[PDB]
């Protein structure tokens, strides 16, 4: 494959003015300042950029690049995207199971994986866990090699690398560039963008492209770059990295002087004549859910720190709450104690579901990259990150709290009420989680999302029905009580528990209540808060919570579908 | 200045094997891998390392290193330490009041500041802000120039720098080093630790120290290291960066072999021979409180975001809470509504105090640098940064909330109840902030500092007196209610507000209460919760609060006196 680009111009001020050149099979590189065009000409050349701006005809072997280009190509990310909880083998297997052809057997698949990991060099480090912050990881060179290895599986012809060295000590850079060189000796077109390279790298380059502030200051063979500037009038000193010399020409030994001197050089005319001569899904759905749910389940268990922290804090809070409220009595303090513990449970679920913000904000980058590459679709990814990150997590505390506290406290000792309480707490957990996802999906930063969730939650807590009596608010503001999840959770719990109780020792009020203002039964307390006393009165809260779950997950799915993928 | 080190060794793994040489007047650097004595020898030579490890002998001009060295040398920190909101002239003024001599007049001080801004090359921006994340900041190069100049006002002789050009571009690091050379041509022996330079900088040195893994690999004229590595059996190609050349030699194109070859050359013999020949408060407490508080205040004004958002959210919450709770009635819902709004105000004060973790945590490094430099004492700095950053920022919400919601709601319309409520809200805000400081003082990362605060506030809010009756807990646990600040706040507010009320229309229960279980007055409700009815029962809640402040502040102060400055 020999990519080519003529008259490319990008518009979000045109960051890319006019670019012409051919990329023969070798080891070419695009380097410029931070204020040049480095991080954009690659996403242009790799179809990672919007087709709106560009105007030239980026064409391979004459054939204008088809629509299946992106899944056919391979583009290594700037930083590393591999998962720290799985091992190198699982990483190279999850990428070889969604990009390969389902018609082939696992024998050929694992054989190709073995060839890849054995030619790359991580065969000695095959089964070793890649590593997260907590667990001892593998060398960063091996991390970059693993990332380079999750794109050799499909066997492309063109490999794009954006900044393969930004984040590596000067030790591993030579080895990684030698690895790339060894790849390029077999017929792969490697196109990478680099940040101030050392001469221990620049020696082996085939073709150089210099992008100085949105213009093409040079494109041609890279051995003939110092000869370009020495015959331009300057002097070639010694003991200086020629790439730093190039990046220093842009900053005082203007930008529109060299850019118009280059068009005068034969490296423009000869290549333009050459170019004028030249011009003259792969997987199922359930398959795209199996491996996503698998990788997510591994990464959630493989990172026991967060999940065990959750379960430990939940068991400890449950035992503390069971010891403080141990043995609820049926007297004047009984109503206050029951209302307080139920409020605390329904509010703990909501305020602890603020950690669902890390689901899609910590994983935004890899999601976008994998989707643009073509592993899966948005719906399969949604369902495979929701079946193994929100079902096995938010279901546990709802069962643990209900197992521990329900019998230490002494709540309603009946077969159904126990499971109804458990189900209610589960629904509150899932609804707060869905709302956190709706507010958080697509947002690249965590802090503003956490602030929004916190403000929404304190307002719903105000309208929950313990602080202010929901039947005393002025009618022009009372409708605000229907937009709050804690209110439905607390209403369901209060209904489930307060129905058949008495709180006045010696006083049977079920008959004729003497001397009102007493609040001597659970039904009087229930109606004072504005709560129905029918089974529909209990189950409409669950209907509302289900509808909230549906609406919020639909909003999250729409925010994932319409996201700016380029 | 002529610094001269000898036979130094440091241990917590004794890191520095054996060092030897002088640092003559000129411009001399130390470079090498990240694991040598690069960030170690410079910290040791400048008396900033803990002196319990040094086994060698430092010397300034033959005499042992004097005590006032820290106040007679200049240690320019690597990264930025200047305040963002203050101005290039205000910073040079604040770093000129506390370090200089109060005997002299402001005429002399401003003359010195002027002759300093002349040399520093900043006569164009002296009157404009240095800049922060929100306001348009001056270029980072002028930031670094300002941070340097802040250490020229005392006119030290020895200037110590560390990685002065890490976080810059190519042509600005060159300007920084040209400025440093223009400084060093005065007799001011500059000594900096550089990191992977381009030879353009390397050409302007006068002595050099290669430190790899903790061994002197070379020391002497920095126009000789290439000659020292050439005449040892190596070859240097053109177009290589000599600093990168040595940092590649350190990896072997072996530490304990290149670390032993040096001893057997003349560039060790000469240094050791010349060495063996050469070896054979400034301000009143008020002048430190005034300027510290003044600088902190000027920095607060130059921060519209935080303080303006605080005021805005307090006003919005005041109006929302006065709308929801507008016109508290004296009926059965009155007790619930009053308890709810007072509980809400107290937990608001507490959970909003959490935002004071960034007071002694985000300005840590600057504190350590300025204290070791000899700016001020711990008590003066503590009282300064606690009388402008915290004193007038916790008074305003407790004023706005009272003034706004006291007459919308319709609380006790007497002259002193209003002021008691304001005083209580301010006291509980101050106590919660004191606890926040006691936890956050002496921690470098915010997250682990905020998790514990949120846990403690959740526990205190459980024990605060609304979610559980404090008279019903078992005695082996009921003593924990004396560790809750929200409990004292909420008890004082309830006492001040509930005392002389009736809540049953048509029933006068002041004398005989007919049909008890009714709760028809404020005395009944107050005693039901375990609160006193005498005036002492209002003010113990206050002394406790005051006590906590004192105690917690003391703790914070101690966590700043025994904090490991070195």
């Amino acid at each position, epitope marked *: 494959a020999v990519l080519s680009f003529h008259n490319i111009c990008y518009r979000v001020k045109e960051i890319l003015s006019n670019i012409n050149g051919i990329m023969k099979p070798g080891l070419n590189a695009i380097l410029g300042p931070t204020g040049g065009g480095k991080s954009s000409l690659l996403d242009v050349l790799a179809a990672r950029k919007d087709p709106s701006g560009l105007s030239g005809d980026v064409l391979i072997n004459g054939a204008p690049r088809p629509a299946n280009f992106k899944c056919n190509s391979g583009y290594v990310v700037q930083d590393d995207v591999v998962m720290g909880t799985l091992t190198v083998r699982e990483n190279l297997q999850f990428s070889a199971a969604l990009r390969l052809a389902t018609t082939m057997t696992n024998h050929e698949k694992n054989e190709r994986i073995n060839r890849v990991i054995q030619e790359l060099g991580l065969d000695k480090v095959a089964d070793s866990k890649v590593g997260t912050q907590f667990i001892r990881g593998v060398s960063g060179g091996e991390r970059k090699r693993t990332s380079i290895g999750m794109e050799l599986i499909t066997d492309p012809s063109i490999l794009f690398l954006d900044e393969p060295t930004t984040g590596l000590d000067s030790s591993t850079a030579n080895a990684v560039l030698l690895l790339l060189k060894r790849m390029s000796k077999q017929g792969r077109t490697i196109i990478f963008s680099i940040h101030q390279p050392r001469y221990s790298i620049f020696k082996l380059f085939d073709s150089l492209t210099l992008l100085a502030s949105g213009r093409l200051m040079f494109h041609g063979p890279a051995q003939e770059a110092l000869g370009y500037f020495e015959s331009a009038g300057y002097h070639c000193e010694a003991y200086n990295n020629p790439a730093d010399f190039f990046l220093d020409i842009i900053n005082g030994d203007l930008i529109e002087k060299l850019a118009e001197i280059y068009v005068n050089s034969s490296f423009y005319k000869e290549t333009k004549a050459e170019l004028h001569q030249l011009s003259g899904y792969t997987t199922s759905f359930c398959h795209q859910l199996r491996w996503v749910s698998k990788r997510s389940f591994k990464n959630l268990l493989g990172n026991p720190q967060a999940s065990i922290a959750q379960i430990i804090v939940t068991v400890v809070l449950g035992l503390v709450i069971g010891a403080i409220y141990f043995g609820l009595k049926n007297d004047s303090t009984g109503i206050q104690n029951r209302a307080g513990v139920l409020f605390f449970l329904t509010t703990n679920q909501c305020f602890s579901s603020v950690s669902a913000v890390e689901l899609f904000v910590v994983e935004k980058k890899l999601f976008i990259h994998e989707y643009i590459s073509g592993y899966y679709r948005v719906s399969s990814y949604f369902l495979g990150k929701l079946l193994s990150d929100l079902l096995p997590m938010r279901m546990l505390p709802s069962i643990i709290f209900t197992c521990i506290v329900y019998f230490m406290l002494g709540l309603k000792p009946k077969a159904d009420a126990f499971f109804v309480m458990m189900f209610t707490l589960m629904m509150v957990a899932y609804s707060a989680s869905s709302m956190a996802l709706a507010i958080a999906a697509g947002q690249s930063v965590v802090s503003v999302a956490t602030l929004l969730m916190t403000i929404c939650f304190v307002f719903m807590m105000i309208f929950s029905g313990l602080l202010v009596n929901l039947t005393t608010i002025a009618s022009w503001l009372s409708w605000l009580q229907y937009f709050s999840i804690p209110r439905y959770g607390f209403t369901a719990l209060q209904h489930n528990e307060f129905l058949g109780q008495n709180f006045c020792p010696g006083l049977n009020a079920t008959g*004729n*209540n003497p001397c009102n*203002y007493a609040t001597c039964t659970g039904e009087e307390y229930l109606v004072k808060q504005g709560i129905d*006393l029918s089974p529909w009165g209990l189950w409409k809260n669950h209907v509302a919570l289900a509808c909230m779950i549906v609406i919020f997950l639909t909003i999250a799915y729409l925010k994932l579908l319409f996201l700016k993928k380029y | 200045a002529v610094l001269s080190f000898h036979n130094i060794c440091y241990r917590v793994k004794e890191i520095l094997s054996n060092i030897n040489g002088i640092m003559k007047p000129g411009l001399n650097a130390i470079l090498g891998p990240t694991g040598g004595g690069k960030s170690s020898l410079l910290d040791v030579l400048a008396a900033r390392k803990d002196p319990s490890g040094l086994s060698g002998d430092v010397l300034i001009n033959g005499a042992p290193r004097p005590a006032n060295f820290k106040c007679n040398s200049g240690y320019v920190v690597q990264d930025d330490v200047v305040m963002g909101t203050l101005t290039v002239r205000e910073n040079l003024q604040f770093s000129a009041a506390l370090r200089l001599a109060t005997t002299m007049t402001n005429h002399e001080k401003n003359e010195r500041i002027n002759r300093v801004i002349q040399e520093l090359g900043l006569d164009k921006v002296a009157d404009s802000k240095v800049g922060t994340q929100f306001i348009r900041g001056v270029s980072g190069g002028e930031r670094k120039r300002t941070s340097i100049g802040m250490e020229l006002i005392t006119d030290p002789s020895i200037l110590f720098l560390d990685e002065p050009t890490t976080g810059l571009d190519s042509s600005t690091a060159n300007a920084v080093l040209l400025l440093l050379k223009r400084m060093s041509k005065q007799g001011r022996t500059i000594i900096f630790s550089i990191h992977q330079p381009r030879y353009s900088i390397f050409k302007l040195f006068d002595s050099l120290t290669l430190l790899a893994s903790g061994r002197l690999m070379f020391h002497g004229p920095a126009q000789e290291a290439l000659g020292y590595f050439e005449s040892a059996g190596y070859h240097c190609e053109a177009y290589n960066n000599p600093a990168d050349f040595f940092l590649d030699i350190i990896n072997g194109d072996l530490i304990e072999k290149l670390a032993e070859i040096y001893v057997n050359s003349s560039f060790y013999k000469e240094t050791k021979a010349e060495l063996h020949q050469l070896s054979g408060y400034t301000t009143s407490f008020c002048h430190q409180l005034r300027w510290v508080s003044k600088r902190s205040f000027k920095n607060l004004l130059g921060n519209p975001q935080a303080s303006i958002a605080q005021i805005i959210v307090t006003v919005v919450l005041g109006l929302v809470i006065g709308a929801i709770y507008f016109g508290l009635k004296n009926d059965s819902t009155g007790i619930q509504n009053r308890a709810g709004v007072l509980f809400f105000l107290t937990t608001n004060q507490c959970f909003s105090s959490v935002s004071a973790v960034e007071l002694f945590v985000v300005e840590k490094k600057l504190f350590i640098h300025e204290y070791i430099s000899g700016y001020y004492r711990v008590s003066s700095y503590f009282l300064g940064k606690l009388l402008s950053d915290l004193l007038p920022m916790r008074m305003l919400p407790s004023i706005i909330f009272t003034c706004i919601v006291y007459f919308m709601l319709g609380l006790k319309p007497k002259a002193d109840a209003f002021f008691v409520m304001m005083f209580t809200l301010m006291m509980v805000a101050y106590s919660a902030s004191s606890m926040a400081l006691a936890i956050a003082a002496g921690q470098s990362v915010v997250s682990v500092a905020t998790l514990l605060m949120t846990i403690c506030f959740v526990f205190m809010m459980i024990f605060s007196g609304l979610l559980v009756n404090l008279t019903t807990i078992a005695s082996w646990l009921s003593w924990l209610q004396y560790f809750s600040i929200p409990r004292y706040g909420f008890t004082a507010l309830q006492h001040n507000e509930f005392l002389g009320q*009736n809540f049953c229309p*048509g*029933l006068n229960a002041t004398g005989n209460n007919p049909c008890n279980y009714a709760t028809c007055t404020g005395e009944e409700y107050l005693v039901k919760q375990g609160i006193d009815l005498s005036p002492w029962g209002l003010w113990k809640n206050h002394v406790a609060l005051a006590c906590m402040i004192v105690i917690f502040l003391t703790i914070a102060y101690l966590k700043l006196l025994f904090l490991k400055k070195y």
Partner: antibody
Amino acid sequence: VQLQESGPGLVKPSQSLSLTCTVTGFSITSDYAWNWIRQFPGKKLEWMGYINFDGGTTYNPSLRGRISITRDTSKNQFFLQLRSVTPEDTATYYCATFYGAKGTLDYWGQGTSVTVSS
Amino acid sequence: DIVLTQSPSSFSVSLGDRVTISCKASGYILNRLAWYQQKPGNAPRLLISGATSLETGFPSRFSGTGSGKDYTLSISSLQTEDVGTYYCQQYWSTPWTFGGGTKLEIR
């Protein structure tokens, strides 16, 4: 306790109306709440508001800004001031008494017809 | 606001036969239901308080039975001194609302 009512039995439209009631046999600052209750032609009933034994007052939300109840604690009286009258306020007023520990309107007045015309 | 309703806004009955009046409400009143009896030209005179109890000066004929949102007064064997309107008041919530009143008649 026994209640008496007095006032003008005819007011001109878009004006004020003022009724008074003397409570003999009890103290209107001792125990109960004291309300006004009007009965239309056609025999519908409507509670208007009450003044408490301690001064607090609460009115029917249908009459906002149009009704005030005040008390002369010196000579045991309370007063109904119904401003911005209309011809549809052609009913008796009764001025009943409400205990509170029992909940019901225990004692009633005698009723005085008030016609509103011109 | 809780709005009472005496669906049989009239009744017709001879002397000595049982009669039953219903006062279905529009919310849970929780036995906070009172029955007043108004005569021609007099003020109402409380007859039942609490939807079950009975006041003094009245015989044991009048009875009150109900729960939830449905309550009924029951006059078994009504005599001559029983004609007149019957209002059902609730004293649960803040605006105390009355019923339409079922004017009894005789035959």
